[PDB]
Amino acid sequence: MLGFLSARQTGLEDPLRLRRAESTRRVLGLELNKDRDVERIHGGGINTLDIEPVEGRYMLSGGSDGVIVLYDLENSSRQSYYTCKAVCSIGRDHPDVHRYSVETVQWYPHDTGMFTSSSFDKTLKVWDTNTLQTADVFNFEETVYSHHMSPVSTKHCLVAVGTRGPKVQLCDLKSGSCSHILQGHRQEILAVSWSPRYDYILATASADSRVKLWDVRRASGCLITLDQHNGKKSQAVESANTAHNGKVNGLCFTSDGLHLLTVGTDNRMRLWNSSNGENTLVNYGKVCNNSKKGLKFTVSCGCSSEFVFVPYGSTIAVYTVYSGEQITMLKGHYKTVDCCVFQSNFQELYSGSRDCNILAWVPSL
Amino acid sequence: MKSDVKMSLSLPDKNEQVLFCRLTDEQHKVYQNFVDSKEVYRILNGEMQIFSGLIALRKICNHPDLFSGEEDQFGYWKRSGKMIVVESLLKIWHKQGQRVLLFSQSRQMLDILEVFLRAQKYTYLKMDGTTTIASRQPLITRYNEDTSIFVFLLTTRVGGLGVNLTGANRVVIYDPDWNPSTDTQARERAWRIGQKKQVTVYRLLTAGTIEEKIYHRQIFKQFLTNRVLKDPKQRRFFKSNDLYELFTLTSPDPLASSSLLAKMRARNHL
Numbered sequence: 001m002l003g004f005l006s007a008r009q010t011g012l013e014d015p016l017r018l019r020r021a022e023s024t025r026r027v028l029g030l031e032l033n034k035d036r037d038v039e040r041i042h043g044g045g046i047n048t049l050d051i052e053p054v055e056g057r058y059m060l061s062g063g064s065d066g067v068i069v070l071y072d073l074e075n076s077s078r079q080s081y082y083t084c085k086a087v088c089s090i091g092r093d094h095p096d097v098h099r100y101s102v103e104t105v106q107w108y109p110h111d112t113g114m115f116t117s118s119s120f121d122k123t124l125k126v127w128d129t130n131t132l133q134t135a136d137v138f139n140f141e142e143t144v145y146s147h148h149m150s151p152v153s154t155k156h157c158l159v160a161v162g163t164r165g166p167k168v169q170l171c172d173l174k175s176g177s178c179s180h181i182l183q184g185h186r187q188e189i190l191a192v193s194w195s196p197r198y199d200y201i202l203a204t205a206s207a208d209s210r211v212k213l214w215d216v217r218r219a220s221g222c223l224i225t226l227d228q229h230n231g232k233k234s235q236a237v238e239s240a241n242t243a244h245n246g247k248v249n250g251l252c253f254t255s256d257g258l259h260l261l262t263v264g265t266d267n268r269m270r271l272w273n274s275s276n277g278e279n280t281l282v283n284y285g286k287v288c289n290n291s292k293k294g295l296k297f298t299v300s301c302g303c304s305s306e307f308v309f310v311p312y313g314s315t316i317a318v319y320t321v322y323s324g325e326q327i328t329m330l331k332g333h334y335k336t337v338d339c340c341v342f343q344s345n346f347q348e349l350y351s352g353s354r355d356c357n358i359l360a361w362v363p364s365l
Numbered sequence: 366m367k368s369d370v371k372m373s374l375s376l377p378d379k380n381e382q383v384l385f386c387r388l389t390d391e392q393h394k395v396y397q398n399f400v401d402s403k404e405v406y407r408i409l410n411g412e413m414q415i416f417s418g419l420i421a422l423r424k425i426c427n428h429p430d431l432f433s434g435e436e437d438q439f440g441y442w443k444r445s446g447k448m449i450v451v452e453s454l455l456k457i458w459h460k461q462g463q464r465v466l467l468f469s470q471s472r473q474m475l476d477i478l479e480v481f482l483r484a485q486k487y488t489y490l491k492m493d494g495t496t497t498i499a500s501r502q503p504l505i506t507r508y509n510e511d512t513s514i515f516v517f518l519l520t521t522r523v524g525g526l527g528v529n530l531t532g533a534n535r536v537v538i539y540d541p542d543w544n545p546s547t548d549t550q551a552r553e554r555a556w557r558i559g560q561k562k563q564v565t566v567y568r569l570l571t572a573g574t575i576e577e578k579i580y581h582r583q584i585f586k587q588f589l590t591n592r593v594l595k596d597p598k599q600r601r602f603f604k605s606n607d608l609y610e611l612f613t614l615t616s617p618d619p620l621a622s623s624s625l626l627a628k629m630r631a632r633n634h635l
Contacts, residue, residue, distance in 0.1 A: 111622035128626050135629040154619040173625055176632055 020304040026347040026363035027300055027307055030318070032332040037083040038350070038358040041069045044101070046352025048296055049341040050115075052107040053151060056345050058087065060115055061352060062102030067091050068117055070129075071358075073343070084360070088132050090117075096125065096134045103144055103293065109151045116159060118144040124161055124171060138171045138178045142188075146294040147171075148202075150194040158216065160202050162189030162294075168204050170216060182214050184222050190249040191294045195274065197257030203274070205251050209242035211262055213277065224277035226262070228270070244268060250295035254306055254321055261308055261321070263289055263297065269310060271321065283324045288313050296339035300347070309349055311337035316351050316361070332359050366595065379556045380565035385572040388426070388616060389446040395432065396425045396574060397614050405612050418612065422575040427474055427540055440477035447539065447569050448481065454567065455487060455516065458535050465516040466533035468551040470540040472520050478539075479518060491518040508532055525550035531559040537567040541576050545583035545590075578611035 004021065007013040044064030051059045051073070059071040068090040075082040090097050100120035108114040114135070118124040120143045126136040142163040149159050158180075161169040168182040168189055187207040195201035195213075201223070205211040212222035227241040234240070244264030252261045253274060260272040267289065271282040287310055289295050299321065300307040306321040314336055318327040333353040340351035349361040367376065388396060399405065399421060408418040424430055428445045442448040451467070458465050469475045472493050482489045490508050492501070501523075508514050509532040517533055525547060536555050538548045552566040570576050585602045592599040 108622050108625075110619040113622040114626055126626075126629065135626045136633060157620065157625065174620065174628065176629065 020302065023303040023347055024305055027303055027318070028327060029363040029365070030328075030330060030347070030349055030361040031364045032330065033360050033362040035081050036360045036362060038071060038360060039083050039086045040356060041086050041089055042067060042356045045335070045354030045356060046338060046358055047101060047103050047293075048105050048339050049350055049352050049358065050106050051341050051343055051350070052112050053109050054112060056343055058107075058112065059084070059341070059350060060105045060107065060117075061358065062105040062117060062119075063356075064101040064354070065092075066098040066100060066102055066119065066121075068098075068102055068105055068127075088129075090127075090132070094132075098123065098125070100143075104146045104148070104296075106147070106149055109149060110154070116147065116149065118147045118161065120144065122163070124159065126173060136173065136176055138176070140169060140178075141165065145188060145190050146192055146296075148192050148194055149173075150199065151196050152194070153199050155199060160192040160194065160204070160216075162192045162204060162206075164188040166206070168192060168202070168214070180216075182216065182222075184212055185210065190247060191251045193251040193253060195257050196253050196255065197274075201274075203251050203253070203260055205243070205248035205262060205264075207247040207249070209244050209246060209248055209264065211243040211248050211251065211260075211272075213260075213274065226260075226270075226272050226277045226279070228279060230279050243270065243272075249289065249291055249293065250297055250310075252297055252299055252308065254299050254308075255301045259321070261297075261299070263287060263295055263310060265289055265291075269308075269319070282322065284319055285324070285326060287317065291336070291338070296341075298340055298342045298349075300342055301344040303347070309340045309342065309351075311340060311351070313337065314353070316340050316349065330361055332361075333357065374558070376556065376558070377560055378563045380563075381552075381568075382565060383568040383570060384450060385577075385617070386447045386450050386569050388571055388574060388614075389444065389449070391434070392425070392429055392445050393614075393616065395429045396422075399425055399431065400612050400614055409609065409612065415609070419575070422612065423540075423579075426571045426574045426576050427471065428477055430473075430477070440480050442481050442484065447571065450569055451478075451481075451537070451539065452485075454535075454537060455485070459487060459515060463535055464512060464514070464533045466519065466530060466536045466555055467516055468519050468521050468524055468536070468538050468540075468548070470521050470542045470547065474540065475518050475520055482516060482518070487516050488514055489516040489518055490514050492524065493518075493520040494523055496523075505530065519551070519554075521547045521551045524554065528554060529557055529559070530554040531557055531561075534562050534564050535567075536564060537569060539569050541568070541570060541579045541583065543579055543582055545587045548583070572617045573613075573615035575611055578605075581605045581607065 004018045008015050008018045042063035048062040057074050061069045069086050070088040071084045072087050073084050098119040098121050102119045105117040113129050116126045122140045124138045125134045128135050140163050142165040145162045147159050147161040157173040159171040166185045170180040171178045185206040189204050189206045191205040193203050200217045203213045211226040213224045214222050225241040226243040244266050246265030248264035250263035260274045263269045267286050269284045269287045271280045297310045308319050308321050310317050314333045316330040335354040337353045352358045433439045505528050533555050536552050555564045588599050588602050
């Protein structure tokens with residue numbers, strides 16, 4: 001490394017090199033920090049975590065018990081050891097607490113003043129962070145498996161919601177219009193994700209093994225259906241063009257938004273070109289999931305090489321996105337792992353699990 | 366709408382007078398009898414379809430064509446009050462050298478109107494679903510091109526719907542409908558671009574009869590359309606409860622998440 005410092009200092013390399021390379025080096029060194037803890041507040045498993053996109057200071061966390069906890073990730077104490085204390089919490093006594101498991105929780109991109117959370121009580125509630133009161137409640141006729149607000153839309157403020165119904169609901173937070181539906185799936189929608197590149201592209205994955213990308217502006221159905229083989233097994237599309245051979249319970253666009261990673265219960269992950277949904281044939285090997293609900297996984301950002309961190313049973317498996325090489329499997333949870341979220345500032349990973357723990361993985365040295 | 370463009374388009378004056386016609390003696394008698402008839406009573410009991418009753422009532426209010434009664438042949442003007450009013454209006458307007466546009470929801474009544482206009486010296490041109498389609502646009506063009514043709518009988522279903530009738534000046538809606546849009550487009554045939562002369566709309570209605578209740582229906586509909594097209598602050602239609610008592614005769618005499626949350630709180634405060 002001192003070579004890296006000397007290269008930065010002399011302008012041999014752009015300073016971008018040392019960031020990105022050092023960021024990567026940090027990611028490869030992720031290790032369970034016992035020099036950092038997250039305060040236990042969930043009585044039930046953590047289904048979801050979300051670090052705020054601006055300033056990355058606060059994390060939301062949704063539990064199987066229905067509570068939403070709001071954690072502060074900055075070490076405000078002077079010690080080197082700290083516990084990420086829980087700022088607020090939608091507890092059992094809140095009048096608005098969810099009744100059943102919170103399945104997704106998301107900071108409003110663009111501003112930390114409002115977050116949204118959806119549950120198995122069939123509601124997507126929008127919250128004022130400051131007063132911690134709901135500002136809006138959308139009711140759905142079927143249990144919500146995931147939602148997602150666009151990380152990029154300065155223009156629209158749609159929330160895509162996937163329920164057990166076969167239809168994707170778009171909920172407009174600007175005047176509250178929960179009527180719009182995308183129709184074309186056939187079984188529950190286990191994962192939705194807006195594109196980080198394009199304002200109005202949404203990808204939705206369903207238990208029917210199909211993943212569709214939609215231009216929600218468009219009035220004409222899906223843009224693309226991802227097909228495992230790219231056409232080697234080609235049929236008039238009524239049942240073919242499955243992304244997976246099981247349920248597809250996870251989606252994640254890569255950072256720059258040029259590829260889509262889907263995980264499904266055939267124990268595979270695939271990487272897809274998000275422009276024409278073609279399959280890049282990245283291998284990745286066998287990725288165990290048997291989650292019956294959405295599997296929340298992330299990608300890294302701002303490294304030399306992009307990584308994807310996928311819950312693999314009771315561990316987080318780290319893979320290199322574009323080559324498939326499994327970097328490592330981070331082993332520190334006790335029960336299955338439900339969600340991992342990446343802190344892009346410091347290359348830290350937080351992962352929740354059914355054992356009611358949120359473990360921080362920070363680079364060593 | 367034609368209010369955000371009127372100053373930028375310069376249309377002429379428009380009027381929407383309504384005339385509450387009074388049912389004549391024979392007309393009154395037939396109506397009073399049929400409301401008291403066992404058939405209406407059975408319809409009120411729901412034993413058969415209501416539509417039959419509504420047809421009958423509308424016919425009665427429209428002309429006593431339930432029963433026909435020299436110079437008292439079928440379709441006699443003096444037998445029905447609305448026809449008397451039409452006589453007076455067409456008289457004054459023909460004296461005004463003005464082109465009239467008379468609409469009727471019915472087609473056979475358009476025939477009785479036709480024979481009437483024979484009985485008068487009013488030169489008309491009639492246009493309904495039975496008039497050939499190929500003769501349709503040339504008929505419209507003919508009426509619009511010359512002022513010789515005075516009145517223009519029209520069934521509202523083909524008479525509405527995109528035809529341009531700027532030639533006519535005066536419009537009278539002779540017969541109400543359950544659909545406000547029908548009469549609206551009917552009256553709007555004249556007051557279009559190219560109408561270089563003032564136009565007034567007369568809605569002829571029978572006070573206290575079925576037609577007033579149909580009027581109430583189409584008002585309530587119009588308010589419902591207004592509540593969702595022009596502005597949601599519509600005033601509640603307080604005049605009627607709108608029940609099945611319409612069989613009676615009662616003649617006269619990035620957003621920064623605080624703009625969002627503010628908007629949300631506004632909507633959910635209601």
